[PDB]
Symmetry: D2
Subunit: 426 residues, 4 copies
C-alpha cells in the first residue's frame, strides 16, 4: 500500500522555501529532521489541515477574526449558527467545568494534559453533526460549519516533549491553532491571577519550536500563537538568558526563583524574541486599554511589520468600571486597525452557562413552570434571528439518524421524528 | 482488617423487616442471595448513601421535590445556589452534549453505557467544590450543597445484567435515585419521540428487581423509579405476558414486533404491576394535562394509596400552545396535591445553554464587546439574588487551592488570588 | 474556501462500486446518492483504516492464509508483528475480561461500554506506529509492515442498526482494517462457546451487515466486513417472523417469549448463504475443532458462492489434545486454508499468555524471589536470537525516539535520556 | 443526614497524638488546617483505608513485603493467586502500555496525570471480582484478595497542588501507598535513565507534606514513600537549599552541576525521614554492600525507619551477581530494614516475552505452539492456577448467580451448555 507514504525531505524543503504561509517562519531544525520522525506512514489530519488553512486565510481576508470561549459542543454550534467564524477553546473553562479529572479546578494546569484535545474533538464532532443536519435539511444559511478552533496549550504541562505531545493530540483532534505561554508549568496561572513565574526567553523559543515541530511531523500548517505573561509576572525561574537579565533585580525567593521587573518593556522584548517562531503574539495585560495595546503593537511592528497580534478581551476585566459605552463599542474595531487580527473572550462560555442556569433555577425555585415558559418563549422569539434549538430533537440529529435508519431499512417501524411531540406541537 | 466487613444475612433481613424505608418494597430474592454476591469487602458509597437518605426524607417532608436537567457540574452548582434541593441528570442531555463518545446524538441509547455515571461523579465533584469553598468563605446561605442526584438509567443498555452494572456505576458515582423504563434498549426513544417499542410487563419487573439488587449488594437505599412509555408506544416485543395480551391487536411488523393499543389504560395497568418494585412511578404523556395526571394518580392510588409519583414537565411540550398563564403558574402545585412528589424539567440545561450562547454570540457577531458587557452587567445585577459566579476565580476554587498551597507552605511566593484582577 | 476533505460525487462512488474488483461480490441495498446525503460538507480521511483494509484484502488473496492472535494491549500487538504475524485480532472477550472502559472484569456478555473496542484499536495502532518510528531511526528493516491490519470484534452491535453504525464508525476512526458482526440478540450476547445464546432473525442480521457497510461507505474506506453465525449451538431465537428461520422453529416458547430453534450446521449453512452477498468473510462458531465439520460448511457455502472467503476461530475454549492428536493439531490451519478459511485466529491467546506468564513468574518469586525473575530475564536474552528486542526496555518504548525529538528541538539539551542510562551501560 | 460528617480537629489531633501509626510522623500543618479543607462531608474510601491498614501491618509483621509491577487487572489477580501480599503499580509500565493518551511512552512523565489512578481502580476492581468469584466457589485458598497497592506518584506532574490532586485521585481509586521522587517534573526520568535533574531538598519535603495533607483531608492513613534520585543525577534546579550546597560544583538551561553518589542520598534520606513511612534510593547496580551503607546511615539517626528497594529489570542481573547472591538478595536486604521490595518492570517483561514466545511459535508451527501453552496451563493447576477455565476466571459464574437471583428460571445463563462445562471439568 502507498496510503500515507511520507513526502521526501526535498518536497518538504521546497514547500518551506516557496509557500507564502512560511514567509516569516524560522525553523532551527531541518526538513531531514522532520522526515526522520515520521516513520513509514503519515496519518492525514483532515480537520486540522482544513481548519489551519481556513484560519490563516480568514486572518488575512477579514478585518479581524473574533471568537468566544466554548466548553461544550452545543456552545460551538450556537457560536457558528450566530455567525462567528472561529471557536476559542479556553483552558480556564476546561479547568472549571470540562476536564478529564471530573473536578472543578482553578486555572493552574491541574487537569490531565489530554483534556483540551478531547474538547477539540468534541467541538469538531458537534460542528460535523450540525453540518450533516444542515445538508439533509437543505439549510445553506451557514457557509462553513467547520469553523477553525484555536485551543489553549497553557505552558505545555512540562518540558519540550510534553509540549510536543499536547500539540500532536490537538492536531489529531482537528485543532486549527494553539497558544503557548512563557510560564513555568508547575506554577502556571490564569493571565489575571497572581503568583506567575516566567521561564527564560530561550525556554519559550524551545516551546514554540516544539509546537511547530509537532505540526511539521503531523504535516499540517497549524497556527502557532506565542503568549507572554511578563506584564504582571514578578518571578522568573533563572537569570541564565542575557535577554532577561535587564529586568532581574538580583533578589531570589526561598524557592530559588528570581525577582524580575514586570510591565510592557519585558513583554515587547519577549514578543520580538518570539516573533520568528510565532504566527500571532499575545501579551496578557492588567486592563482593557487601547493606548497600551497601541504601544505594544507599534513596538513589535517596528521590527516585524507583518507580525499579526492576538488580544484577550477578558471577562476578568470589569468593563464598564474602566470604559464608557462608546469605547466599548469601538474596542475590537480599534484593536483590529493596530494588527490584533485574533480577538477572543476567554471565559464567555463559563459566564453564559453559569448566569443562564442561575437565572432559570432562581425563577423556577420561586414560580416553577412560569420561569421555564419565559425561556421557551424567548427561544421561539429568537427563531427570527436564526435560532433552531427550540426544536431540540432535530437539533441533536434525530432527523439525521432517521435518515441512516431508512437508508439501512426504508420500511423501519421504529424511526423517531414521525409521531414525535416535536412534529405535533412545534 | 475489619474495614468494609459485610453484614450477615440476619442483619440485612432485620433491616428489611423493621426499617420503614422498606415498608412498601417487594424483593423476590433473599438476604442470603445479597450476601452471596458481596465478596469479603463492601465499599462504602458515602454520597450514594447520603443522597438517597436526603432524597427519601425530602420526598416525605416537602410539598414536592422539583429539579432541572443538569449536564455540567457548574449547572448543578447554580441550581443549588438558586435554592433547588435536587439535581435531575437527563440521558437526553448526555446524548446531545455530554457523553463519552464525544458525539452529538438523539435520544436512542447510542452513547456508551458509563456516560451518565461519569456525569453523576462530575456533578458530585462540582457540588463538593462549592461546599469546600463555602466552608473557607464562611458562607452558610446554602444548607446542603450535596443535593441528591436523580439520574437516567434509560432501558438499562441491554439485559438485566446491563441494568445491574449501570445501577452499580451510578451508585459508585454517588447517585441518590435512578429511573428505568419499559422500552426495548435496542429501539430506545425519548418519551416524546415516535417509534417506541415496549418490553413485556414481567421483563420490566426483572429490570426493577435488578436495579434494587445492585443497590442492595452496594448496601445503599437508592430511590428506584419505574417509568412506563405505554401512553404513546404502539409496539411490544412479545405477547408472552398475560397482563399485556388485552392491548395486543394480533398484527406483527416485519421486525416481529406486536402492535399494541396505546394510552392511559396500559399505563395504569403497568404502574400497578410495577408499584411493589418502584419507590416512584412515572408515565410519559403526550401533553401537559392536569386532568390526565389526576386520572393516572387516582387509578394507581386506588390500589396503592401511599405510592409516590413522578412527573416530567417536558420542554418537548409547547407550553403556551396547550395552557394559559394561570394554569402554567399552578401546574406543579396541583400535581403535588395528586401525589407527584418528584417533578423535573428534563431538557432545561440544553435550552438554557443553547439559548444563552446563541443570544450572546449573535450580539457579539453584530456589536462585539457591547454584547458581552450586557451579560456582565446582568451578572453584577444578579449578585443581589445570591449569584456569585461574576467572581469566576473564587467560583472554581482559586481561594480553596490557595488555602491548600499555604497549608503545605505558608511562605509560598506563587499563590493565585493575591495580585489577581479579581482582588483588584 | 478550502477544498480539503471535499466529498466525492454520487457518480464517482457509483463508478467505483461498478468497476473496482474489491466490490465484485458485494450487494448494497442503498444507493450512492444515499451515502453522499449522509456525508455533510467534509469527509475526514481515515489513513490507517484505509491502509489496513487495503493491506488486509490484498493479504487474504495473496497469502495461503492470514493468521492472528488476540491482542488486548499495544505491546502485545508489537510482539505479534516482531514475531512475524501479518494481522492483529482484537477480541471483545479479552476487552470484557481485562481491557474495557468500565475498569471492571466481565464475562463475554456485551456488559462493557460500546466505545471500548475502538479505544483498543486506536491503542494498538499507536503502539505499532511507535514500533515503526523506532525501527526507522534504528535503521531496522527486519519488519516490512509494522502497521499490520487489525480485525476487531463488533459483537452484536450493542443494540440496533444505529448502534452497529456508530460502532463501525468508531472502529474506522481508530484505524480498524476489518470488523465482525454476529447474529445474536445484543441484550443476551454470549461468547460463541458459552450457553444461553439467542439468535435474531436472518433479515435482522442482514440489516446489521448493511449498517456496517453503510458506515464504511460514509467514512469512504473499504473496511473488511465479517459475518458470524452462532446458529451451531444457539437453541433460542427472538422471533419466528423470518420464513428462512421457520424450518428450525420447534413451536415452543420460553417465559421470556424466546422461540426454541433446532441448532447445528444446517441453520449455519442457511444463514451463511443468506449473509454471503453482505459479507467479505463468513465465520460459523462450532463446538469442537473438527476438520470434517469445517469441510462440510465450506463445501456447502462455496457450492452457491465459489469465491466466498471464510474465517475460523481456533478457540482456547476447546480442550485441543482432548479432541485431536499432535499430527492433526500440526496440520490444522494448513488444512483449513485449503478449504477457503483465509482468516484464522486464536481469540483468547493474549488472555492465556498474560495470565499464565504472570502466574508462573509470581509463583516462582513467592518461593525464590530474584532467582525466578532472573530465569525470565535469561529467557529474554536467549530470545534475542529469534528477533526479540524488549530486553532493552527503554528503546522498546521509544526512549531513543523521544531523545531524537528532544535533540531536533534543542541539539544541545543537557537532559536527554539514553546517554548515561543503565541500558547504554549494561545491555 | 449525619452520613460522612467530618471529625473535629480535637479528634484528629487525639489520633495523631496517640495512634502508634503516627509515632515517627512530622506534620508542619495543624489538625485545624485539615478540617478547614474537608467541607461538610468526607467520603469514605474503604479500599484506600483497608489497603493502607493491611500494608502497614504487613510491613511490621512479615520478614518483608515483596511485589511485582502489574499493569493490568488480570496481572494483579495472578500475583495474588500465586501468593503475593502486595501489588506494585509502575509509572514506567503505565507510560509504556497502560496510560490514558493511548500512546507508548518512555518514562518521562509524558502521560496524563490521572493514568496511574485509573490503573489503581482497575486493579482493585479485578481483585474484587476474584474475591466475589472465590466466595461463590467456596475457594478459601487466598486469605486476602484485596492485596494493598503501592503506586507511582512520579514527581507529582508539577507543583505541590499537582502532587495533592494525584494523591487524592490515588486514594479515591483505593491505593494503599504512593511514592514521590525528588526530580524536576518537566525533566522527569526513569531512575535508570540519564539526564536526571534534582529539585532542592526543601521542595521534596513540600511534595511529601502535600502527599500527607491529601491523605489527611481524605481521612486515610496512606503509606507515603520518599524516593531520592541523587545517586546518579548530576544536575539540580537551584543551589538555594544549604543542605544541597555541599554537592554543588551551570548549564545553558540554568541547571547547577552537582556531585552524585551515596553521600547526597544519605543526606536527603535523613532530611525526608520525618515525612516518609519508607525511603527508597535509586542505585546504579544491585549491590548488597551499598544497600548496607545506606540502611546503616539512615537507621543510625532513625532506628525504626523502614526502607524500600527497587530490584530493577534495568539491571543485567547475572552480569553483576552470581546465582548464590541472587538467591539470598531479598532475604539479605530484609535483614537491613528494606521491608518493601519490588521488581518495577516485571509485568512489561512477562507480557512482552510471553506474547513474543507464543507469536513466534505460532508463526512457525500454528496450533502446535498454542497447544504447548494450553498444556502448561493444565499442568499449573497443581500449583493453584485457575485461568485455564477462562469463563469462570472472568466471572461467568458470578454473573450467572446475579442472573438467577433476578430470575431463577432465566433461559439465557452462560455456564450451562458452555464448552468450559463440557471439555474442562
Ligand atoms: C484566565 C485568563 C485567560 C487565560 O489565561 O487563558 C483570563 O482571565 O481571561
Ligand atoms: C426526552 C424526554 C425525556 C426522557 O425521555 O428522558 C423529553 O422529551 O422530556
Ligand atoms: C469467546 C469465543 C470468541 C468470541 O465469541 O468472540 C471463544 O470462546 O473463542
Ligand atoms: C524505570 C525505573 C523505575 C522507576 O523509575 O520507576 C527502573 O528502571 O526500575
Ligand atoms: Mg489559559
Ligand atoms: Mg512571526
Ligand atoms: Mg431519558
Ligand atoms: Mg411502590
Ligand atoms: Mg467476541
Ligand atoms: Mg460475500
Ligand atoms: Mg516511575
Ligand atoms: Mg519516617
Amino acid at each position: 500500500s502507498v496510503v500515507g507514504t511520507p513526502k521526501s525531505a526535498e518536497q518538504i524543503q521546497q514547500e518551506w522555501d516557496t509557500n507564502p504561509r512560511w514567509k516569516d517562519v524560522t525553523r532551527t531544525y531541518s526538513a531531514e529532521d522532520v522526515v526522520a520522525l515520521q516513520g513509514s506512514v503519515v496519518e492525514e489530519h483532515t480537520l486540522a489541515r482544513r481548519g489551519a488553512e481556513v484560519l490563516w486565510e480568514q486572518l488575512h481576508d477579514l478585518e479581524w477574526v473574533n471568537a468566544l470561549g466554548a466548553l461544550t459542543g452545543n456552545m460551538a454550534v450556537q457560536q457558528v449558527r450566530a455567525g462567528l467564524k472561529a471557536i476559542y477553546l479556553s483552558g480556564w473553562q476546561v479547568a472549571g467545568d470540562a476536564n478529564l479529572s471530573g473536578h472543578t479546578y482553578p486555572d493552574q494546569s491541574l487537569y490531565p494534559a489530554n483534556s483540551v484535545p478531547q474538547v477539540v474533538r468534541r467541538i469538531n464532532n458537534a460542528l460535523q453533526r450540525a453540518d450533516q443536519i444542515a445538508k439533509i435539511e437543505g439549510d445553506t444559511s451557514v457557509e462553513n460549519w467547520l469553523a477553525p478552533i484555536v485551543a489553549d496549550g497553557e505552558a505545555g504541562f512540562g518540558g519540550a516533549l510534553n509540549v510536543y505531545e499536547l500539540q500532536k493530540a490537538l492536531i489529531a483532534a482537528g485543532v486549527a491553532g494553539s497558544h503557548w505561554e512563557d510560564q513555568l508549568a508547575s506554577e502556571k496561572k490564569c493571565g489575571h491571577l497572581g503568583g506567575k513565574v516566567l521561564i527564560p526567553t530561550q525556554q519559550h523559543i524551545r516551546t514554540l519550536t516544539s509546537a511547530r515541530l509537532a505540526a511539521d511531523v503531523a504535516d499540517v500548517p497549524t497556527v502557532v500563537i506565542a503568549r507572554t505573561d511578563a506584564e504582571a509576572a514578578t518571578l522568573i525561574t533563572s537569570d541564565v538568558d542575557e535577554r532577561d537579565q535587564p529586568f532581574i533585580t538580583g533578589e531570589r525567593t526561598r524557592e530559588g526563583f528570581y525577582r524580575t521587573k514586570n510591565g510592557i518593556e519585558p513583554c515587547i522584548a519577549r514578543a520580538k524574541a518570539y516573533a520568528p517562531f510565532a504566527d500571532l503574539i499575545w501579551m496578557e495585560t492588567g486592563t482593557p486599554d487601547l493606548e497600551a495595546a497601541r504601544q505594544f503593537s507599534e513596538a513589535v511592528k517596528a521590527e516585524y511589520p507583518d507580525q499579526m497580534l492576538a488580544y484577550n478581551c477578558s471577562p476578568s476585566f470589569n468593563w464598564k468600571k474602566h470604559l464608557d459605552d462608546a469605547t466599548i463599542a469601538k474596542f475590537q474595531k480599534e484593536l483590529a486597525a493596530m494588527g490584533f487580527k485574533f480577538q477572543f473572550i476567554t471565559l464567555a462560555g463559563f459566564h453564559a452557562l453559569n448566569y443562564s442556569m442561575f437565572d432559570l433555577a432562581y425563577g423556577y425555585a420561586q414560580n416553577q413552570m412560569s420561569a421555564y415558559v419565559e425561556l421557551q418563549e424567548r427561544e421561539f422569539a429568537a427563531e427570527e434571528r436564526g435560532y433552531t434549538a427550540t426544536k431540540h430533537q432535530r437539533e441533536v440529529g434525530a432527523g439525521y439518524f432517521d435518515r441512516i435508519a431508512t437508508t439501512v431499512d426504508p420500511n423501519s417501524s421504529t424511526t423517531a421524528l414521525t409521531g414525535s411531540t416535536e412534529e405535533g406541537q412545534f
